[model samples]
Structure formats: structure tokens, C-alpha cells
Target: HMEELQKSIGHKPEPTDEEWELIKTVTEAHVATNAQGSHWKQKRKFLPEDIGVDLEAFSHFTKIITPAITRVVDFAKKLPMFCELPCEDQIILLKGCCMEIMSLRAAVRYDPESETLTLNGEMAVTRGQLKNGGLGVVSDAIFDLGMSLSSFNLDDTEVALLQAVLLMSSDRPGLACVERIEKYQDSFLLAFEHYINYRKHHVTHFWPKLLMKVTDLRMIGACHASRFLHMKVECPTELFPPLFLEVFE
Candidate 1:
């Protein structure tokens, strides 16, 4: 499958063997390899105790996932292609897509069959728990996105390339060089399109379907941002990690 994708996009400037290996390594480090294993388990549930919200659990969730975001950013910085961009453009790209990428990462924690998100496959949080915690709409959207993506049964290579495509958006505001960024994005898109097309039997419309989820994710992020603001006013301190606040800001 990948061999055909490589053949189709051979004309375009693509990552070298070493670079592609790094990309796959970085992406897999964030996205779970096993959807039903201990990888998704959390020490505590996202439930609030009594009348008060147990934001500590929420905080733990963020902390647990924060390293993935950090690693991705670090990986981007080290990518030979991304390193060629201006520093300001790099920062803009990270700021623009950080939450979106994290949302994608979070989607991997969902288990569609059981309709529950488990922490390390031990602690489980159901749809009811999310709604009870005031995260009904946004949380469900994220989980739904995950479930849809999971249906594709995408491999590590595809997910890594998709993450690269999301990160290289030229349309971001304040980009110093849109053309250069798009040039990079086009390469990734070409590779991904060819890769999807190679799986003619199983992934006839996978590319379009997956791309649409990116749009859905943006909408989910907007709703989450609005809710975060409301939560901030209701509980100003310790409800969320400073890293989460930084991302939303």
C-alpha cells in the first residue's frame, strides 16, 4: 500500500526515509496503538464529587495528555522541513493547530463498542458522566470523531501523514510565507490522497471522510473554548491545568 503511495507521489518532494521514520515515531507516541488497552486508562475518572465539580480529575486528564502535545511540538521543531519556516510562522502554526491536534489525540481514548472512554482500560467514563460534568456536547463530539476515525482502521503511517498535513496549514493567519507552507501541505496531501486511493476496496471515500472530520474537530474546539471561558468564570482556579488555559488562550 505504502509502496504504491510512494510511487504516485514520487515526483513531489517527500520526506526521506529517516525523516519519515521520525514522523511516524512522533505521531504514534501521541496516538494510541491499542484502543482497548491500558494506554487509554486514567488514574481517576472525569466525574465531579457531590455538588462541587471534581476538576482535579479533569486536571489529571489534561496533565496526562499534555506530554503528547509537547512531544508533537518538539517533533515539529526538529523536522527538517518545519525548521525551514520562519520562527514566527512556526509559533503561529503551533498555536493554530495545537488544540486541534490534541483533540485528535483525545479521540483515540474513546471506545465505540462499549460507548465509554476508559483510562488505561481500567477506569471508565461514560456519556452520562460527561454530561453530568457539563461536557456533554463537546466531549461527545470529540468521541464521535474518534469513533469515526477508528472505523477507518488507519495505520500509523496514515495518521502520521495526516498530522503533518494538519500542522502545515498555509491558511493560518499571520503566516509569513503562505506559498511555502502550502507547498509543504500539498506534498503531504498528495501523499495522503495516493495512500488512501491505494486501498480501493476498503477506503473508497476515506480521504474525504477524514478531511471532513478536521472541519468537525474545529467546530468542537470552538464549543470547548466557549465552555472553558464559562468554567473559568465559575471556578477561576485549579479547575484546569495552566497548560490547557494556555492552549485556549
Candidate 2:
């Protein structure tokens, strides 16, 4: 039924091989990152049993996210336009979207069927384990974000472009060239809109839903720093990833 309606216009189900290359490396960066936690279980919803001393699970958590942090820099340089911006601006965009992209990567890393994340595409770490490992509220939020996007059954291109839109957010303070970045945002937004419209051709909605997710990313990005430190309070004496500290603090 859907294909029949799609016949009414010129629509291709997938991008060309060359065009696909633009987004492919970025998606793989997420895949490359997951190669890396456990413990408290069976507690009530509200004030639950403490994950307690399972902060032990956090060190492994630390190493995996380290690669995840550094990998996206390649996503920037490999993609078309970002590195073309001033070197100063390039540094700012990466830091500006650092938490947001990390949030997105964590979401994508989350595997819904098992209710876990596939580490380095191998090990499966459960959500409870993440909490027990001393991950705080932001981890919970990222899980929600992943589960929400799961309903959409998104493909790599959608994810890639959405991330591109995130990186180009000109609203971040200290941006040296807001107008220039805003200009690219328009290009990214329009491409995202058109691609979504084309891919889900038989569908009548989803565009707005995706944008709402973008808004959600922005919200998550804003509070990420404090939520990050909240983890420290949850477990004192454990230093965070070095890249993470430099990226945020």
C-alpha cells in the first residue's frame, strides 16, 4: 500500500552510495565507541534500594565514553562543511555540542530489545548497571530519549543529519560567528526536512516529531554540565574522563 502511493512521485528509497558516504562515517563513529558496568536490582519505584557500592562499575563506564568523546572529532572533519569554519569556531562547535552529542551517542548506544547498550558493538550493559555504576539522572534521560526515538525506527541517515543539525546550533554562547553557523543550520534543517519528507513519503507526520526531539536535545544539553557533576557527588573520589573534564569544566 505504501509503495503504491510512493509511485505518485519521484522518490528513491535510499540514497546513492556516494551520497550515503557523507553520513556513513559519522554513524560508524557511534558504533566504534560502544566497546566497553552492573549490580543493584529489584527495588521499588520511588525511594529505592541504593546501588550502594557498585560505583566499581563506573571505571569501565569511564573508558568507553572516552573513545566516544574523541571519535566525534573525526565526524566533524570527515563531514563536508564544519572544518571549513574558522579553527577557533571549529573548536567552539565541538565543545558546544559536546554534551548534546554525547547524549545522542548514549541514546543510540542503548539497545531497546535487551534494554541494554552494546559496548564496542559487543558487550551488553544493562540500564540498571549504568545506574549502579554511578550514572545519575542524565543517564536516565538519555535512556528515555533513545526509547522515544526507537519508536520512530530511525535509520542512519536521519541520525547523522540530526546530529549535524545539533552541531550547527548557533545559540551556544561564545560563538564567534553566529550568523555564519546559523546559515549552515538552515542548510542542514532544510536538508533534514526534505529528506524526512521524502523517505517517509506515505506518512503524513514525523517532521514535527523529529524537531521536538531536537528541542529535547537542546534541553538535555543545557543541563548536562550540572547533571554531570551530580554524578561526582553520587560517588566521591572518582575522577571523570579527562576529555570530559576538559570538554565541560
Candidate 3:
């Protein structure tokens, strides 16, 4: 049957060219096709369990880092005025955050052999066909947001929630992904705060002050940003790469 199908398709009943190549290389020393089959290839290219950072530290890193950078993007996008800035200037801010993200990624190590992200020998994430350890959550959220938007079912409220989730995960501590969903208590509260402020102020326009507040809250927590506001007053400044700043200012 396999041969018949392959003949009909003008090929053999085997993997595609790319898969065949990978399988050939990966199964070179294995005796059985199933033992080292490409069908069971690891989901994530990077594994930490094999690398050894501190498990707690790794999780902490993911929880904090992913959300922090995401907030930067959110602030840039949500600010109605920032949207008016020149594309070049917007790109500058985006690049800055991306650079920061690279550093954060480097802080977490990956192990391929064991298919794990290990922080000091404890497993942070594991190999799974459907998920890429801790990274799956981030990837999944991004996919769902795009799907929601494409479906035209995403309203402003949904957008705000999605943005919050992304921002909160932007600076995710390396191991935070392993934490129970209940661990996101502070994040939930802050997201709620953002929604409340948006409704209370009727704030459709992304004011710099508000965007800054939102970003800071996600990074430092609402209680901290509130305390910060009491101690210091910050003024709106120039935003670069120049499209949105001038018009909004």
C-alpha cells in the first residue's frame, strides 16, 4: 500500500527530501528506525536541562524578562501619539527592546541531548511533540492572538488582554513558565488595573504618560509603579526612528 501510494505520487513511501536528510543523519548509528526516528524529533532546538543554570533562577528569568520587553512593544503600539512617530524612530525603540531580549535569551541556556532546559541540573522544560517546553506558552499566545484578530472576533478588550499577556511574558523569568498559573496572580491584577484605567479615563488615545505607566507596572508591578509616581515626576520626551512623537507631542 505504501509503495502504491508512492508510485501514484511519483515517489517512494518515505519521508520528504528534507525529512529524509535529517533522518539519515540522526539515525546514523541507531539500529531501529523508531529508536531515533525523526517523527519524534524534539520540539525545541534549545534545551536547558542539559545545560545547567539554576532552575529557580531560570524560571525567574523567564517570568520577568518576557513580560518586560513585551510591555515595551505594547507601550509603543498603544500610545496613539507614538503611532504618529516616524517609522524609523519606532524601529529604533523596537530594536532596542529586541537587543535586550537577545541578552535575556542568552541568560537561559539549552540542552539538546537531554531535550531539557536545566537550571543547575533541575529540569526547567521538557521535550514534547506538541509543545516546546516553556517556550510553547509564548508561541501559543502569539498564535492565538493572530488567529483571533484574523477571525475578527477580537475586540478592544480582547486586544488589551492579549497585549497584557504578551507584555507580562516578555521578561519571563527562565523558570516562571514552570510555575502554576496561580503564580501569575500579580500579572492578572495589573492587567485588570490597565483595563480599569482605560475604562475609567475613557482613554482611547494612547497618552505617553499612560503608556509609560502601563509598561512600568508590568515590569515593576502596580504597587511599585504607584510608589514610583509618588516619588518622581517624569515628563514626556522625544521618541525616535520620529513618526509618532512630534504629532502626539
Candidate 4:
């Protein structure tokens, strides 16, 4: 009965001998692997002999498992919200949900070393602008800094700040910051747009996409959190509304 409920939705590739062994071990539980898949026993917490090899193997396997696992967890967490809707509406919701999750994943890449936190781009850019504001202002500081911004993943906090900057910049059209946003916002949006389109397109398209790449489950769990603080911040009338209407509204 339970086995039928666990039917594989798609092809379940034949596992390698090592993976089959691990799965068997996990099912039986004389020992289980760590998140990084280092072997661990109930009696022996750490096996120095197993630890090194397990950690190395875990890292290798992670690249294969990461995206699929993340997608499954994402679907489970958010699919319920669309349950009451008609079939078409549910499909629409799932596409949107997938895009959001992918966007968060890209944001997590900002600091690959950190596993899940984002590196600071806006603050670094802001500081650079402040430090060099007086120097000619000739060649376009924002454009120069834009390259740096593209270098790494941004965590949610930095993405929130980026969104704030974009909102404010849009509000003050033609201002330097607005000019900066006009030049740079799409680059951020492009990264996410391409990722979603690569996986699944035709669901939606919205302007001024803002959200950092995500690295871990916690980041996805914290989705939609910006509303608490950003709700009151008024944005430029002409800009945000069209973008919102096209995509989110």
C-alpha cells in the first residue's frame, strides 16, 4: 500500500553500486551518512577512516542531487497553495513557484564558499561610490561597479537592499541612482530570466526582477519575507506599477 503511494513520478535512474549500498544502509540504519554523506554509525559518531573518503564522495554526489532535491522540496512546500485552484491555475502557480526558487538559487551563488549566505554587493558599491564621488564623476561609476555586482551571489538581505535601491531609483526617475538602475537592474533580472526559461518558460514575465540567488533550504523557507518592511516604501508610480501589472499583479 505504502509502496504504491511512493511511485516515482519520472525515470528513476539505476543507481551505481556505491549509491545502492548507501541507500540500503540508510534504509536499514546500522549507519547513515551525514548531509555531506560521511558515514556515521549509531555507536560510532565519527569514523576518521570513513570521514575523509565519505566527505569527498558526498561533495561529488551533491552536485547531482542538489538541484533535484531542492526542486522537490520547493514543490512540496509551495504546491499546496495552488491545490484549490483549477488545473490550469495550478500549473501557472507551479511555474511561478519554480522561477522564484531558481532565482533564490542563483542568489546563493554570490558566495559559493558560504554555502547559503550572500556576499555584500550594494554596500560595497555604495562605499566605493561614496569614496570616489568627487573624482570627475565622468566615466559612470555605476557602470564600472556593475561588473563587480555581477561577480557573486547576493543573500536575501542584500537583495532586499537591491530592491529598495531599485524602487527608490525608479521613484526618482532621471536621478543618478535611477540611471544606475536602468543600466543594471536588467542584468540581475536576466540571470533569473534565463534560468527560468531554460527550465520552463511561458508562465510569466515581469520587469525589475529582484531576489537573490538562494543556497540552502532556509533561504527558500524565508520567501516573501520582504513584505513586512518594504510594504510602506513608496516606489515610482510609472515604473513599478507596469512591471507589477505585467508579472505579479
Cα displacement (angstroms), candidate 3, residue 248, comes to 25
All models: lDDT?
0.64, 0.66, 0.33, 0.29
Return the clash pairs for model 2, or none: 34-119, 34-120, 35-119, 35-120
- Per-candidate clashes come to 5, 4, 54, 11
Better of 3 and 4 by TM-score: 4
Model 2: residue 224 alpha-carbon error in angstroms = 2.3
The list of candidate 2 runs beyond 4 A from truth reads 1-54, 119-123, 201-204, 232-238
Task: Please give, for residues 12-109, the per-residue lDDT of candidate 3 as tens digits.
Answer: 23343543342333223111211112222343233433333133333443444444344445444653333544565455435433322222221122
Residue 72 alpha-carbon offset, candidate 3, angstroms: 11
List candidate 3 segments past 4 Å from native.
1-42, 45-48, 53-84, 96-249
Please provide TM-scores, in order, for all candidate models, with all chains considered together.
0.73, 0.75, 0.20, 0.23
* lDDT, model 4: 0.29
Model 1 weakest lDDT span, ten residues long: 44-53
Stretches off by above 4 angstroms in model 4 are 1-87, 90-92, 95-99, 112-222, 225-232, 241-246
Arranged by TM-score, best first: 2, 1, 4, 3
Kindly list the per-residue Cα lDDT of model 2 for residues 1-249, writing each as its tens digit.
244355368553344354355446545643443233112122112112343226556766676666767766766776567866888888888888877776675576566556765443433566676656655565577788888877776766677788888888888778788998998887666666656655774444688888898888877876777766776667564457778777777
Candidates 1 and 4, the one with greater TM-score? 1
Question: Model 1: clashing residue pairs?
Answer: 38-120, 40-120, 41-119, 41-120, 42-119
Q: Show model 1 residue runs off by greater than 4 Å.
A: 1-54, 118-124, 130-136
Better of 2 and 4 by lDDT: 2
